[PDB]
Amino acid sequence: TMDKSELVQKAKLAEQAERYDDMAAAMKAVTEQGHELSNEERNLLSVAYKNVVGARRSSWRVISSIEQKTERNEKKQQMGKEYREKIEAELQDICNDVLELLDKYLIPNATQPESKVFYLKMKGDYFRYLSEVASGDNKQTTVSNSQQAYQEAFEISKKEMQPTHPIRLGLALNFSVFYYEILNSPEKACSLAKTAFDEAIAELDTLNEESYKDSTLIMQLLRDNLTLWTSE
Amino acid sequence: MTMDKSELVQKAKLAEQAERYDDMAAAMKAVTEQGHELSNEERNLLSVAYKNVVGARRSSWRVISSIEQKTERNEKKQQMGKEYREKIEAELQDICNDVLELLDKYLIPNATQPESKVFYLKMKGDYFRYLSEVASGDNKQTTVSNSQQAYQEAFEISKKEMQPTHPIRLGLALNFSVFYYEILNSPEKACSLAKTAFDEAIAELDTLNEESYKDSTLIMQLLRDNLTLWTSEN
Fold first, then answer.
1. Is-contact A149 A176, C-beta < 8 A?
2. What DSSP string runs through B12-35?
3. How many structural domains does chain B have?
4. Nearest by CB to B14, which of A6, A58, A63?
5. CB-CB neighbors (< 8 A) of A78 in chain B
6. What distance in Å separates residue B71's CA from the closest CA in chain A?
7. Cα torsion for A15, B54, B172, B143, to the nearest 10°?
8. Closest Cα in chain B to A15
9. DSSP code per residue over chain A
10. Which of A63, A183, B185, B217 is deepest in the core (most CB within 10 A)?
11. Taking Cα atoms as reference points, which of B68, B103, B101 lies closest to residue B83?
12. Are B190 and B180 in contact (CB under 8 A)?
């Protein structure tokens, strides 16, 4: 039963030591005390799970790729399948953990739009990661929950934050990638990405020093996707 | 659930590609525990797995230690760093202990070829040295001593079973001489070990093949290099 200061300091030590499971466990405990997280605490939570889930996603695609290679030995095929499944179950546990934190503590206790959008975007991301390894029927539910979360985030971000805000831009980035990669709709992905990019560059006066680099980084990622998707 | 050896090796290789080294180590641990001499592929997978598993904790340990020295004394920032280092130290001790048990229970006694036996003894030396980096004052001399003993025994076997120019033996001479200089702070003995190994190989240079000599001479050069470096220090 550590207090937040100690758990955050542990999270930061774990991050420097590249021990992200520890970092996630720390920030999960912080989150479970049921209080609104600071920007720093929220970033630490986000980075921890980004790394914890990202490692499985990378692993999952490495194994899925190896499964496509010609293989005549049945035991090796089974090992590939069972190892993929092992990773999927880990991925499912991680996402379920994240989505529970969001549903039980983070989203309902959020009193400021910035956080609400951040957490809803997160809900969208983690339901998307679930959907990538989902079995069918659960596949449609997860894809649909992802879309609903992004959509809710998006509507709030348009009312409550500047078009150049990193969270709003990041949401447009991920939501547009969702449309292209998960929903297989270039038309929806391009509409959203173009809208968010155009809205940003129409309001360069909303940029600020503190987030200038994050803003312009994500704006360029949006432009890059648009160019790629328009080339098809 | 309950995998055979073909399954565990394939899992290890899949784990390696997926960068899931704990899984890779777990798989090759189970293979080793079946009690048979490992093939070269199997031995390589085991070695690489544990190298990565222990490597991660050693890197983590060094990072936390640096942070620790930078911090002020009256702070809790010292306390949390102390407990996190100790958590990493215990994980390290556990990994090393697992490897050492594998080596003494299965790998070393079942080795029927001198190359394998020497490989496993050199590992034993390595994992004792890793333990010695995080061992407390009292415990530290024993670990360094067990490390020395393992390297020694590997080196002795190489002297009996391999030619002076054999790269495994030369590689053992190099590691062993540097161990004396760096860990035991015994530069005179370090020079003596280097010189002996270098001289013994030189005496048999003429027997090497023209197309492969570099496999030996590259290591002999390093032995020569250390000898010059060390004997220039008054």
1. no
2. HHHHHHTT-HHHHHHHHHHHHTT-
3. 1
4. A63
5. 7
6. 13
7. 110
8. B60
9. ---HHHHHHHHHHHHHTT-HHHHHHHHHHHHHT-SPPPHHHHHHHHHHHHHHHHHHHHHHHHHHHHHHS----HHHHHHHHHHHHHHHHHHHHHHHHHHHHIIIIIHHH--SHHHHHHHHHHHHHHHHHHHHT--SSHHHHHHHHHHHHHHHHHHHHHHHS-TT-HHHHHHHHHHHHIIIIIS--HHHHHHHHHHHHHHHHTTGGG--TTTHHHHHHHHHHHHHHHHHHHH-
10. A63
11. B68
12. yes
Residue found under tokens 């920030």: A27
Q: Which value, to the nearest 10 degrees, does the dihedral of the CA atoms of residues A216, A217, A220, A222 take?
A: -100
B84 in contact with A, Cβ within 8 Å: yes
In this complex, the residue of B14, B20, B63 whose CB is nearest that of residue A80 is: B14
Q: Using DSSP, state whether A175 is helix, strand or coil.
A: helix
Radius of gyration of chain A measured on its C-alpha atoms: 19
Does residue A197 contact residue A148 with C-beta atoms inside 8 Å? Answer: no
- For the domain that residue A78 is a member of, what is the CATH number? 1.20.190.20
Length of chain B: 234
Chain A residue whose CA is closest to B63: A17
A111 at interface of B, judged by CB pairs closer than 8 A? no
Among chain B residues, CA nearest to A19: B60
Contacts of A18 in chain B (CB under 8 A): 56, 59-60, 63
Q: How was this structure determined?
A: X-ray
Rounded to the nearest angstrom, the minimum Cα separation between A88 and chain B is 13
Q: How far is Cα A158 from Cα B60, in angstroms, rounded to an integer?
A: 43
Angle at B11 between CA A62 and CA A82, to 5 degrees: 75
User: What sign for the dihedral angle of Cα B138, B141, B143, B145?
Assistant: negative
Sequence-ordered list of residues with C-beta below 8 angstroms from that of A216, at least 6 positions apart, any chain: A207
Resolution, angstroms, 1 dp: 2.2
Quick check: A87 and B18 in contact, CB under 8 A? Answer: yes
Residue contact B19–A80, C-beta within 8 A: no
C-alpha A167, offset from chain centre:
12
Token pair in block for residue B188: 């005179």
Give B11 to chain A, closest Cα distance, Å: 6
Domain holding A148, by residue range, is 1-232
Residue type, A178: F
Radius of gyration of chain B (CA): 20
Residue B126 tokens, joined: 């390595």
Sequence letter at residue A198: D
Q: Which residues of A touch B17 (CB under 8 A)?
A: 62-63, 66
Amino acid at B216: S
